[PDB]
Scaffold this active site. Structure first.
Site, PDB file in Angstrom:
ATOM      1  N   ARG A 240       4.658  -4.141   3.802  1.00 53.90           N
ATOM      2  CA  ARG A 240       3.819  -4.256   4.991  1.00 53.90           C
ATOM      3  C   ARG A 240       4.428  -5.112   6.089  1.00 53.90           C
ATOM      4  NH1 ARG A 240      -1.537  -2.836   3.871  1.00 53.90           N
ATOM      5  NH2 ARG A 240      -2.566  -4.610   4.984  1.00 53.90           N
TER       6      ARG A 240
ATOM      7  N   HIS B  83       6.125  -8.201   0.574  1.00 53.06           N
ATOM      8  CA  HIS B  83       4.744  -8.128   1.099  1.00 53.06           C
ATOM      9  C   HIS B  83       4.205  -6.701   0.941  1.00 53.06           C
ATOM     10  CE1 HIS B  83       1.917 -10.620   3.781  1.00 53.06           C
ATOM     11  NE2 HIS B  83       1.322  -9.437   3.795  1.00 53.06           N
TER      12      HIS B  83
ATOM     13  N   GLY C  69      -1.651  -6.334  -6.252  1.00 57.90           N
ATOM     14  CA  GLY C  69      -2.482  -6.288  -5.054  1.00 57.90           C
ATOM     15  C   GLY C  69      -3.335  -5.035  -4.962  1.00 57.90           C
ATOM     16  N   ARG C  70      -2.793  -3.951  -4.434  1.00 55.68           N
ATOM     17  CA  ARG C  70      -3.615  -2.747  -4.182  1.00 55.68           C
ATOM     18  C   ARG C  70      -4.448  -2.298  -5.380  1.00 55.68           C
ATOM     19  NH1 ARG C  70       1.216  -2.086  -1.317  1.00 55.68           N
ATOM     20  NH2 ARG C  70       1.011  -1.706   0.971  1.00 55.68           N
TER      21      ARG C  70
ATOM     22  N   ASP D 129       6.241  -9.370  -6.927  1.00 55.54           N
ATOM     23  CA  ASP D 129       5.186  -8.388  -6.717  1.00 55.54           C
ATOM     24  C   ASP D 129       5.748  -7.168  -6.005  1.00 55.54           C
ATOM     25  OD1 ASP D 129       5.148  -8.901  -3.924  1.00 55.54           O
ATOM     26  OD2 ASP D 129       3.240  -9.983  -3.998  1.00 55.54           O
ATOM     27  N   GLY D 130       4.882  -6.190  -5.828  1.00 56.18           N
ATOM     28  CA  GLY D 130       5.225  -4.960  -5.126  1.00 56.18           C
ATOM     29  C   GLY D 130       5.293  -3.794  -6.075  1.00 56.18           C
ATOM     30  N   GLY D 131       4.252  -2.957  -6.100  1.00 62.47           N
ATOM     31  CA  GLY D 131       4.320  -1.748  -6.893  1.00 62.47           C
ATOM     32  C   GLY D 131       3.992  -1.868  -8.364  1.00 62.47           C
ATOM     33  N   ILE D 132       3.518  -3.021  -8.857  1.00 64.31           N
ATOM     34  CA  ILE D 132       3.187  -3.117 -10.280  1.00 64.31           C
ATOM     35  C   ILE D 132       1.955  -2.244 -10.535  1.00 64.31           C
ATOM     36  CG2 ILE D 132       2.460  -4.683 -12.146  1.00 64.31           C
ATOM     37  CD1 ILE D 132       5.405  -5.184 -11.230  1.00 64.31           C
TER      38      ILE D 132
ATOM     39  N   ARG E 253       1.942  -1.861  11.468  1.00 67.49           N
ATOM     40  CA  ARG E 253       1.335  -0.928  10.524  1.00 67.49           C
ATOM     41  C   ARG E 253       0.870   0.309  11.306  1.00 67.49           C
ATOM     42  NH1 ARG E 253      -0.938  -5.875   7.338  1.00 67.49           N
ATOM     43  NH2 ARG E 253       0.957  -7.034   6.765  1.00 67.49           N
TER      44      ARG E 253
HETATM   45  C1  LIG Z   1      -2.531  -4.449   0.278  1.00 67.20           C
HETATM   46  C2  LIG Z   1      -2.594  -5.683   1.033  1.00 67.20           C
HETATM   47  C3  LIG Z   1      -1.664  -6.719   0.800  1.00 67.20           C
HETATM   48  C4  LIG Z   1      -1.700  -7.919   1.496  1.00 67.20           C
HETATM   49  C5  LIG Z   1      -2.748  -8.142   2.434  1.00 67.20           C
HETATM   50  C6  LIG Z   1      -3.656  -7.109   2.660  1.00 67.20           C
HETATM   51  C7  LIG Z   1      -3.579  -5.934   1.987  1.00 67.20           C
HETATM   52  C8  LIG Z   1      -4.598  -4.866   2.248  1.00 67.20           C
HETATM   53  N1  LIG Z   1      -2.777  -9.284   3.092  1.00 67.20           N
HETATM   54  C9  LIG Z   1      -2.605  -9.059   4.495  1.00 67.20           C
HETATM   55  O1  LIG Z   1      -2.801  -7.990   5.105  1.00 67.20           O
HETATM   56  C10 LIG Z   1      -2.205 -10.235   5.460  1.00 67.20           C
HETATM   57  C11 LIG Z   1      -2.394  -9.918   6.949  1.00 67.20           C
HETATM   58  O2  LIG Z   1      -3.426  -9.260   7.287  1.00 67.20           O
HETATM   59  O3  LIG Z   1      -1.544 -10.442   7.724  1.00 67.20           O
HETATM   60  C12 LIG Z   1      -2.182 -10.407   2.594  1.00 67.20           C
HETATM   61  C13 LIG Z   1      -1.084 -10.168   1.749  1.00 67.20           C
HETATM   62  N2  LIG Z   1      -0.320 -11.192   1.366  1.00 67.20           N
HETATM   63  C14 LIG Z   1      -0.617 -12.450   1.652  1.00 67.20           C
HETATM   64  O4  LIG Z   1       0.130 -13.472   1.307  1.00 67.20           O
HETATM   65  N3  LIG Z   1      -1.757 -12.728   2.423  1.00 67.20           N
HETATM   66  C15 LIG Z   1      -2.510 -11.708   2.887  1.00 67.20           C
HETATM   67  O5  LIG Z   1      -3.538 -12.007   3.568  1.00 67.20           O
HETATM   68  N4  LIG Z   1      -0.791  -8.963   1.301  1.00 67.20           N
HETATM   69  C16 LIG Z   1       0.370  -8.720   0.374  1.00 67.20           C
HETATM   70  C17 LIG Z   1       0.146  -9.021  -1.122  1.00 67.20           C
HETATM   71  O6  LIG Z   1      -0.251 -10.300  -1.465  1.00 67.20           O
HETATM   72  C18 LIG Z   1       1.069  -8.380  -2.106  1.00 67.20           C
HETATM   73  O7  LIG Z   1       2.321  -8.996  -1.680  1.00 67.20           O
HETATM   74  C19 LIG Z   1       1.248  -6.935  -2.080  1.00 67.20           C
HETATM   75  O8  LIG Z   1      -0.122  -6.367  -2.140  1.00 67.20           O
HETATM   76  C20 LIG Z   1       1.841  -6.608  -3.468  1.00 67.20           C
HETATM   77  O9  LIG Z   1       2.107  -5.265  -3.615  1.00 67.20           O
HETATM   78  P1  LIG Z   1       1.095  -4.241  -4.385  1.00 67.20           P
HETATM   79  O10 LIG Z   1      -0.073  -4.053  -3.425  1.00 67.20           O
HETATM   80  O11 LIG Z   1       1.959  -3.023  -4.451  1.00 67.20           O
HETATM   81  O12 LIG Z   1       0.663  -4.754  -5.742  1.00 67.20           O
END
Ligand SMILES: Cc1cc2c(cc1C)N(C(=O)CC(=O)O)c1c([nH]c(=O)[nH]c1=O)N2C[C@H](O)[C@H](O)[C@H](O)COP(=O)(O)O
Ligand SMILES: Cc1cc2c(cc1C)N(C(=O)CC(=O)O)c1c([nH]c(=O)[nH]c1=O)N2C[C@H](O)[C@H](O)[C@H](O)COP(=O)(O)O
Ligand SMILES: Cc1cc2c(cc1C)N(C(=O)CC(=O)O)c1c([nH]c(=O)[nH]c1=O)N2C[C@H](O)[C@H](O)[C@H](O)COP(=O)(O)O
Ligand SMILES: Cc1cc2c(cc1C)N(C(=O)CC(=O)O)c1c([nH]c(=O)[nH]c1=O)N2C[C@H](O)[C@H](O)[C@H](O)COP(=O)(O)O
EC number: 1.1.3.46
Lengths: 333, 333, 333, 333
Positions: A231, A228, A282-283, A259-262, A161
């Site tokens: 990320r 993810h 997520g976000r 997921d992703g971008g909803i 990142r």
């Molecule tokens: C924005 C964000 C997302 C994620 C995380 C932190 C943040 C700040 N997590 C980590 O940083 C893991 C790490 O630190 O290694 C995390 C993670 N997924 C997961 O299984 N365990 C996690 O613990 N995700 C992805 C998430 O679950 C969704 O896949 C994604 O957010 C859908 O996309 P959108 O955000 O567009 O709705």
């Protein structure tokens, strides 16, 4: 707030820049982060007209529970980064909205505290170098009343990142992994988890059709088709671009989430028309938490519920099952 | 430096504008230069999950040598334009990284000096009006320990580089072709070289499927699918757009490399998933040389190695051969 | 001047804005004007390597004459708008370059004066309300030594040129139609012309495949696949997008030329690889005339000749016939 | 005024911002609003040449009446928002141009007053919670001389218009629904209307092929393929993208109209070449009304008539039926 984008603006004002970047950023050039949005924007729905909409319902049954929307809160680590109540604020709002909340392995409040909020939560697992600690988290989660194990399989290690590197981002001293390093998970790890629990195991981070098939063969109760949030691998295809092919290949053998971008109820509709059982968000949930705590998350979930109902009815769908039978057309943006 | 783009910025600061333009520019309207990047940006990888990553290795065997990455330094003429140590700085960093370095016919340090650095180098040939001088360069290269002859076949003459014309660019007096004009090469020239050396002959600049087949029939040990970084025919298709069709047509009869626009480990992964044996990298190596000499090139190669390892493992690939079996999907940017 | 774009800048400086707009503009929203450029930019050539380039020639035989390039100057009305020598300056430069020049029905110098320049010219016909005047122009043209009749068939009336309307553009008093209103031409008009002359009749403005076939059946010696530079129907497909299908349908029964947006030798190469016999070039010739009169047109034609030779040889083509056998690939810009 | 875009500029000057936003806006992110324009811009026409254009006519017969153009004024609620004469100004201009005018259920002047203008008008129906009021509007419309019932079927409720929400837009006190709440319409409602009137029933808002087929089976005399100008489901496909498939499926069983984004005579031509019987035009008519009242609408309709005649003749079409037989090609913008 009349759209999810109102909340991103609100969260950018309040959060420190490096925490906003931890939340917003992706790996590498952020190609997959952008593509998650591009891919949804290219999907158009072909709505149906003149159907009975007397009792439109957005409810689904998934992993043995009724949910109020075809949506759950994605696992997002370290939610005290965004608000002092962190995970408890989000879990309370999710419970009150009837939406499943995914408790993270890297939660900043212990999984037992968050589970005590109620709301029948799920638990997201990372595989650890110490295997026994992973199976102990699973049993802790089950003992605390979690209803599904969301095994994240796309993090053999964390992606690169570049915002975090450029910011020299680190957790503040006041934020910790309260449940307490990665080991790559394998199919053997999946079987060890499946044997350790009677809860449904959901593999999150599947993009290849063959891996979705193998997940069904491995006894998964669901998969999350996901890159993810852009990320992990930069250049990984968006889940939404693989979803239709994956839904056809598993042919009802497990739940298929995406997921992703909803970012709206219309996006939920697109995902369901492409065959998803449900989405994760997520976000936007973290934007709402940053902006206004528990009440902010409540407002976001009420807005999403209204948008999902609106989009379903405008498309002629009295149920989520009907929305899954809608057809789509790719367009140009 | 956390991306290759950090180094372009660094090189633009230090170099004279007309030398930066010689390095950055393409022919004509620079349509092929831009398309090399567009084409890679449109490729998305479908990663695999849950594979054994105990011993991820980025090594390959090519032309009888183990290389540390599926990458070599492209032939770039006149490297003393970018740093006073020129080719010797780059060759030393490549040797220390375990990456093949391609010594140019138009090198600004003699090929014997650069070969004495070690690292098992390759030699890039231009065909000359005086044929005997071309076959003498080949024998010099072989006598000095070069391990492959990279015959550049896309320069019957140099393309129209409008930046250089507009700048009135010429070599400074302190930069010369130290090994000492073009004649068009033909298939007869290829056979003359093949008969003059037992080293593998690699034809660089192939884009047509039929020419890749004919290269195998002609006894080439490899080809580089390439439009010369957009510097030769303006409007030539990117190599990355021809690579999959070419890999299928030669069906293992020679190594198939690609170049043009590789700017990250993720791009290396895309090229290998489309079937490349290895890539060449040109401009980024010169950015690093301009920015910081030998140490700059070392830092670039360490960054690329880290990005290649990261991308391979995130995509479930313990070896470059596994990465070649990944599938891809074209997207919209 | 190192590209045709240098000349557009030069012409914009010198010409009055409303005359520049008459030259540059298209009909309606200028969608077809822009699409002529977009369509060429999407075409990429697959060059061949290692061919004999001992005697690269850009010459063609067309309508019984050798031409120095696969190019002619398009018919552009009223060339005294751009320079006081108007058509005579352009025709002299075309003659000296060995390029056919198309004398317009709406020329601002009489067709007999322009034909007296020499260079074996062509004559472009508009059908007139008074038919007999049209057949008289044809016989005048033939009597003066024109070698082909380019019958423009896409102007039943002039398109809606909104720049001209907004400018209230009219011919200056010093510019007249020196050969002296439209009637729609029909296939009957084509036959009347074919019966009136032994010169080859070339139908300019064909875009439908069926109309290209019918042109061959009607005894045309050639067609120009063309949307009139985006000046007639706004929303008409670019000729370059119809060219390959049209070349296949006529299957050598007449010459197939194309115009619209040709701005370099590389563009000429693309058109020939898509199967054109030759191109017409319109606006760039007028830019050169505006910028520098006869010498300007000479410089443009020398630049285009150099670019065509360069592109052909870089693509492995010793003749225009070889360039027609090149393959192409559509890309994304 | 030389294009419809001149009138949008004029209307933006005069109208209050929140009324301009009510007129211009769409639902959600306005993805479908933008896509209506993108979709038309991607369509290119393949014109025919050398056809007889002695008597070009833009007339059509539809629902038992000759119309001067293949166009009608779309139903737009509350036209007194834009000009004090509202619907009467528009209906008078439409009558004088020979264009059908659609009287709205939510008209700000009563349907009997607008019908008294003459011009053989149509009537647009919304289904109401009180069914009997809906069938009474139908009988009122028929009694007043309306010639078709345009049943809008894509508004079970109004979409989420975020501009209106952000503006807190409400009707001024001086604007009312002069014919006097939504109930979802169903196929049963369609049959109730069909049984209540001998007028042709036209279902507006159809996008799915199956719904177009069912409309024919239900006895509809026409459909309007439409996403309600991007104001209902955000993410609904443009009608123009479904039109060709729908025209093939109904195979002449009813009239197939289209709307959304028509902004020129060339756009009318594109719609007819894709198989539409006729188009509706909404926002541009209101721009003209805002800018200059009845005379403004007259000028717009005269401009559109000129553009339709121009485009048809440039494409070789002496009649709208010939324009429906034109072929099209998708391009890139
Ligand atoms: C924005 C964000 C997302 C994620 C995380 C932190 C943040 C700040 N997590 C980590 O940083 C893991 C790490 O630190 O290694 C995390 C993670 N997924 C997961 O299984 N365990 C996690 O613990 N995700 C992805 C998430 O679950 C969704 O896949 C994604 O957010 C859908 O996309 P959108 O955000 O567009 O709705
Ligand atoms: C940027 C640059 C590239 C090249 C050169 C100089 C520069 C400044 N050389 C010449 O200028 C030759 C001449 O002066 O006639 C040169 C050459 N290729 C070759 O066989 N021999 C050369 O001697 N190339 C192309 C190269 O090897 C890669 O094909 C391309 O760099 C991959 O694309 P990227 O840069 O996006 O990674
Ligand atoms: C730019 C320009 C073009 C044309 C004209 C004037 C101008 C200023 N002529 C008219 O205005 C006719 C009129 O006044 O009714 C004209 C004409 N075509 C023709 O048969 N007779 C003409 O007399 N054309 C189109 C041309 O021959 C090429 O088709 C096009 O220029 C290729 O496109 P490019 O410009 O991108 O190379
Ligand atoms: C711009 C505009 C359009 C509409 C309305 C108001 C405005 C300001 N009406 C409503 O707001 C209904 C409500 O208030 O619930 C309305 C309506 N359609 C209909 O059946 N009844 C209506 O009463 N439409 C859509 C229309 O008829 C066309 O489908 C569209 O305008 C073609 O697209 P264009 O504008 O790009 O030409």
């Amino acid at each position: 707030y009349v759209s999810l984008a109102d909340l991103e603006r609100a969260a950018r004002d309040v959060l420190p820049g490096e925490i906003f970047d931890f939340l917003a950023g992706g790996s590498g050039t952020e190609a997959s982060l952008v593509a998650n949005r591009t891919a949804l924007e290219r999907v158009f729905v072909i709505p149906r007209m003149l159907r009975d909409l007397t009792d439109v319902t957005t409810e689904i049954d998934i992993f043995g529970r009724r949910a109020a929307l075809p949506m759950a809160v994605a696992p997002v680590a370290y939610q005290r980064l965004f608000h002092p109540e962190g995970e408890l604020a989000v879990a309370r709002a999710a419970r009150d909205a009837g939406v499943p909340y995914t408790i993270c392995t890297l939660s900043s409040v212990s999984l037992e505290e968050i589970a005590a909020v109620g709301g029948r939560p799920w638990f997201q697992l990372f595989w650890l170098r110490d295997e026994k600690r992973s199976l102990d988290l699973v049993r802790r989660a089950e003992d605390a009343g979690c209803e599904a194990i969301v095994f994240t399989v796309d993090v053999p290690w964390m992606g690169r990142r570049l915002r975090d590197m450029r910011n020299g981002f680190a957790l503040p001293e006041w934020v910790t992994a309260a449940n307490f390093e990665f080991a790559p998970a394998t199919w053997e790890s999946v079987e060890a988890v499946r044997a350790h629990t009677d809860l449904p195991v959901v593999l999150k981070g599947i993009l290849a059709v063959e891996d979705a098939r193998r997940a069904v063969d491995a006894g998964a109760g669901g998969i999350v088709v996901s890159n993810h949030g852009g990320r992990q691998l930069d250049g990984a295809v968006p889940g939404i671009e693989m979803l239709g092919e994956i839904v056809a290949a598993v042919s009802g053998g497990c739940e298929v989430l995406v997921d992703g971008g909803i970012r709206s109820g219309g996006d939920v509709l697109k995902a369901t028309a492409l065959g998803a059982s449900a989405v994760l968000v997520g976000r936007p949930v973290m934007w709402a938490l940053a902006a206004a705590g528990q009440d902010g998350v409540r407002q976001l979930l009420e807005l999403l519920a209204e948008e999902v109902r609106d989009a379903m009815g405008l498309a002629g769908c009295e149920s989520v099952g009907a929305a899954r039978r809608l057809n789509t057309k790719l367009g140009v943006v």
